[PDB]
Amino acid sequence: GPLGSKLNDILHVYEKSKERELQSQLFNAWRNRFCFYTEECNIQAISKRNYQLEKMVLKKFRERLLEIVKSEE
Protein backbone atom coordinates (compact mmCIF):
# COMPACT_ATOMS: atom_id res chain seq x y z
CA GLY A 1 0.00 0.00 0.00
CA PRO A 2 2.16 2.90 1.34
CA LEU A 3 5.16 0.99 -0.06
CA GLY A 4 3.56 0.20 -3.47
CA SER A 5 1.96 -2.97 -4.80
CA LYS A 6 2.79 -6.25 -3.07
CA LEU A 7 4.56 -7.18 -6.34
CA ASN A 8 6.50 -3.91 -6.43
CA ASP A 9 7.49 -4.33 -2.79
CA ILE A 10 8.84 -7.83 -3.40
CA LEU A 11 10.98 -6.20 -6.09
CA HIS A 12 12.30 -3.52 -3.73
CA VAL A 13 13.44 -5.98 -1.04
CA TYR A 14 15.13 -8.06 -3.80
CA GLU A 15 17.00 -5.09 -5.35
CA LYS A 16 18.20 -3.92 -1.94
CA SER A 17 19.67 -7.29 -0.98
CA LYS A 18 21.32 -7.41 -4.39
CA GLU A 19 22.74 -3.90 -4.04
CA ARG A 20 24.10 -4.99 -0.69
CA GLU A 21 25.69 -8.14 -2.08
CA LEU A 22 27.23 -6.05 -4.87
CA GLN A 23 28.79 -3.58 -2.43
CA SER A 24 29.97 -6.45 -0.24
CA GLN A 25 31.58 -8.37 -3.08
CA LEU A 26 33.39 -5.46 -4.67
CA PHE A 27 34.46 -3.99 -1.34
CA ASN A 28 35.97 -7.37 -0.60
CA ALA A 29 37.75 -7.51 -3.97
CA TRP A 30 39.09 -4.00 -3.35
CA ARG A 31 40.32 -5.02 0.09
CA ASN A 32 41.90 -8.22 -1.28
CA ARG A 33 44.01 -6.45 -3.92
CA PHE A 34 44.93 -3.92 -1.29
CA CYS A 35 46.36 -6.72 0.91
CA PHE A 36 47.95 -8.44 -2.03
CA TYR A 37 50.10 -5.40 -2.89
CA THR A 38 50.72 -3.87 0.54
CA GLU A 39 51.11 -7.09 2.52
CA GLU A 40 51.79 -10.18 0.42
CA CYS A 41 53.96 -8.54 -2.25
CA ASN A 42 55.65 -6.15 0.15
CA ILE A 43 56.95 -9.06 2.23
CA GLN A 44 58.17 -10.78 -0.97
CA ALA A 45 59.90 -7.57 -2.02
CA ILE A 46 61.58 -7.05 1.34
CA SER A 47 62.69 -10.72 1.27
CA LYS A 48 64.29 -10.42 -2.19
CA ARG A 49 66.06 -7.22 -1.16
CA ASN A 50 67.37 -8.66 2.10
CA TYR A 51 68.37 -11.95 0.48
CA GLN A 52 70.42 -10.32 -2.29
CA LEU A 53 72.14 -7.98 0.16
CA GLU A 54 73.18 -10.99 2.23
CA LYS A 55 74.38 -12.83 -0.91
CA MET A 56 76.50 -9.76 -1.74
CA VAL A 57 78.16 -9.93 1.70
CA LEU A 58 78.96 -13.65 1.50
CA LYS A 59 80.56 -13.22 -1.91
CA LYS A 60 82.74 -10.72 -0.04
CA PHE A 61 83.58 -13.24 2.67
CA ARG A 62 84.65 -15.82 0.04
CA GLU A 63 86.91 -13.27 -1.65
CA ARG A 64 88.63 -12.30 1.58
CA LEU A 65 89.12 -15.93 2.70
CA LEU A 66 91.11 -16.37 -0.52
CA GLU A 67 93.10 -13.19 0.17
CA ILE A 68 93.97 -14.53 3.64
CA VAL A 69 95.11 -17.89 2.17
CA LYS A 70 96.96 -15.95 -0.56
CA SER A 71 98.28 -13.78 2.31
CA GLU A 72 100.98 -16.33 3.29
CA GLU A 73 102.01 -18.20 0.10
Binding site: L7, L11, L22, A29, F34
Partner: protein, 149 residues
Amino acid sequence: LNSELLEEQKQEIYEAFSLFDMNNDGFLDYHELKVAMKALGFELPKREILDLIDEYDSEGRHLMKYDDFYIVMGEKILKRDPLDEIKRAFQLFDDDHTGKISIKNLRRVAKELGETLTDEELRAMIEEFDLDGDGEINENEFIAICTDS
Protein backbone atom coordinates in the same frame (compact mmCIF):
# COMPACT_ATOMS: atom_id res chain seq x y z
CA LEU B 1 34.35 -18.12 -24.45
CA ASN B 2 31.14 -18.31 -22.35
CA SER B 3 28.53 -20.24 -24.38
CA GLU B 4 26.72 -21.56 -21.29
CA LEU B 5 25.04 -20.34 -18.12
CA LEU B 6 27.11 -20.83 -14.98
CA GLU B 7 25.41 -22.15 -11.83
CA GLU B 8 25.03 -18.73 -10.17
CA GLN B 9 23.28 -17.61 -13.34
CA LYS B 10 20.76 -20.48 -13.56
CA GLN B 11 20.17 -19.87 -9.86
CA GLU B 12 19.52 -16.18 -10.47
CA ILE B 13 16.87 -17.07 -13.07
CA TYR B 14 15.11 -19.56 -10.82
CA GLU B 15 15.08 -17.20 -7.82
CA ALA B 16 13.80 -14.23 -9.81
CA PHE B 17 10.95 -16.25 -11.28
CA SER B 18 10.08 -17.83 -7.93
CA LEU B 19 9.68 -14.41 -6.35
CA PHE B 20 6.76 -13.48 -8.62
CA ASP B 21 4.85 -16.74 -9.20
CA MET B 22 2.15 -15.72 -6.76
CA ASN B 23 -0.38 -18.48 -7.40
CA ASN B 24 2.55 -20.89 -7.56
CA ASP B 25 1.60 -22.39 -10.92
CA GLY B 26 4.86 -22.15 -12.86
CA PHE B 27 3.49 -19.24 -14.90
CA LEU B 28 3.77 -15.44 -14.75
CA ASP B 29 1.21 -12.94 -16.01
CA TYR B 30 2.12 -9.62 -17.61
CA HIS B 31 2.33 -7.68 -14.34
CA GLU B 32 4.30 -10.43 -12.63
CA LEU B 33 6.65 -10.74 -15.61
CA LYS B 34 7.25 -6.96 -15.83
CA VAL B 35 8.78 -6.95 -12.35
CA ALA B 36 10.56 -10.30 -12.85
CA MET B 37 12.52 -8.76 -15.69
CA LYS B 38 13.20 -5.56 -13.77
CA ALA B 39 14.69 -7.83 -11.10
CA LEU B 40 17.10 -9.31 -13.63
CA GLY B 41 18.01 -5.93 -15.14
CA PHE B 42 15.94 -6.38 -18.29
CA GLU B 43 13.31 -3.63 -18.25
CA LEU B 44 11.17 -3.56 -21.42
CA PRO B 45 8.35 -1.22 -22.58
CA LYS B 46 4.80 -2.57 -22.12
CA ARG B 47 4.34 -3.59 -25.75
CA GLU B 48 7.70 -5.42 -25.95
CA ILE B 49 6.89 -7.58 -22.91
CA LEU B 50 3.52 -8.32 -24.49
CA ASP B 51 5.19 -9.11 -27.82
CA LEU B 52 7.49 -11.49 -25.95
CA ILE B 53 4.57 -13.22 -24.25
CA ASP B 54 2.73 -13.62 -27.57
CA GLU B 55 5.86 -15.12 -29.12
CA TYR B 56 6.00 -18.07 -26.69
CA ASP B 57 2.28 -18.68 -26.22
CA SER B 58 0.46 -21.62 -27.85
CA GLU B 59 -2.94 -21.18 -26.15
CA GLY B 60 -4.19 -17.58 -25.92
CA ARG B 61 -3.36 -16.47 -22.38
CA HIS B 62 -1.11 -13.58 -21.43
CA LEU B 63 1.03 -16.06 -19.50
CA MET B 64 4.65 -17.09 -19.67
CA LYS B 65 5.82 -20.63 -18.87
CA TYR B 66 8.87 -20.99 -16.61
CA ASP B 67 10.66 -23.09 -19.25
CA ASP B 68 10.26 -20.18 -21.69
CA PHE B 69 11.28 -17.51 -19.19
CA TYR B 70 14.39 -19.62 -18.55
CA ILE B 71 15.36 -19.59 -22.22
CA VAL B 72 14.66 -15.90 -22.90
CA MET B 73 16.29 -14.57 -19.71
CA GLY B 74 19.10 -17.04 -20.33
CA GLU B 75 20.24 -15.48 -23.60
CA LYS B 76 19.78 -12.01 -22.15
CA ILE B 77 22.01 -13.01 -19.25
CA LEU B 78 24.75 -14.39 -21.53
CA LYS B 79 24.88 -11.02 -23.34
CA ARG B 80 25.49 -9.22 -20.03
CA ASP B 81 28.49 -6.85 -20.17
CA PRO B 82 30.26 -7.35 -16.83
CA LEU B 83 31.28 -3.69 -16.87
CA ASP B 84 27.70 -2.50 -16.31
CA GLU B 85 27.73 -4.24 -12.95
CA ILE B 86 31.02 -2.52 -12.00
CA LYS B 87 29.67 0.90 -12.98
CA ARG B 88 26.37 0.29 -11.15
CA ALA B 89 28.39 -0.62 -8.07
CA PHE B 90 30.33 2.60 -8.35
CA GLN B 91 27.05 4.53 -8.05
CA LEU B 92 26.30 2.62 -4.85
CA PHE B 93 29.62 3.58 -3.33
CA ASP B 94 29.15 7.22 -4.42
CA ASP B 95 26.20 8.10 -2.10
CA ASP B 96 26.40 11.80 -2.69
CA HIS B 97 26.89 11.56 -6.46
CA THR B 98 30.10 13.51 -6.83
CA GLY B 99 31.63 11.22 -9.46
CA LYS B 100 34.16 10.11 -6.83
CA ILE B 101 34.40 7.72 -3.90
CA SER B 102 35.67 9.72 -0.95
CA ILE B 103 36.73 8.41 2.45
CA LYS B 104 33.31 9.32 3.89
CA ASN B 105 31.69 7.26 1.12
CA LEU B 106 33.90 4.24 1.77
CA ARG B 107 33.48 4.46 5.55
CA ARG B 108 29.71 4.29 5.02
CA VAL B 109 30.06 1.18 2.84
CA ALA B 110 32.31 -0.57 5.35
CA LYS B 111 29.99 0.22 8.25
CA GLU B 112 26.98 -0.96 6.24
CA LEU B 113 28.74 -4.29 5.53
CA GLY B 114 29.47 -4.54 9.25
CA GLU B 115 33.24 -4.33 8.75
CA THR B 116 35.32 -2.58 11.41
CA LEU B 117 38.01 -0.55 9.70
CA THR B 118 40.00 2.32 11.18
CA ASP B 119 40.10 5.51 9.10
CA GLU B 120 43.81 4.89 8.42
CA GLU B 121 42.92 1.53 6.87
CA LEU B 122 40.29 3.27 4.78
CA ARG B 123 42.71 6.05 3.82
CA ALA B 124 45.36 3.51 2.81
CA MET B 125 42.86 1.56 0.71
CA ILE B 126 42.18 4.67 -1.37
CA GLU B 127 45.81 5.77 -1.43
CA GLU B 128 47.05 2.60 -3.14
CA PHE B 129 44.61 2.94 -6.04
CA ASP B 130 44.28 6.73 -6.31
CA LEU B 131 46.38 7.45 -9.37
CA ASP B 132 45.80 11.15 -10.10
CA GLY B 133 46.40 11.95 -6.41
CA ASP B 134 43.29 13.88 -5.37
CA GLY B 135 42.75 11.52 -2.43
CA GLU B 136 39.55 10.03 -3.86
CA ILE B 137 38.63 7.26 -6.32
CA ASN B 138 36.98 8.22 -9.65
CA GLU B 139 35.05 5.80 -11.92
CA ASN B 140 37.97 4.72 -14.13
CA GLU B 141 40.04 4.11 -11.00
CA PHE B 142 37.31 1.93 -9.54
CA ILE B 143 37.05 -0.09 -12.74
CA ALA B 144 40.82 -0.65 -12.46
CA ILE B 145 40.38 -2.10 -8.97
CA CYS B 146 37.80 -4.61 -10.25
CA THR B 147 39.87 -5.86 -13.24
CA ASP B 148 43.04 -7.79 -14.23
CA SER B 149 44.52 -5.60 -17.03
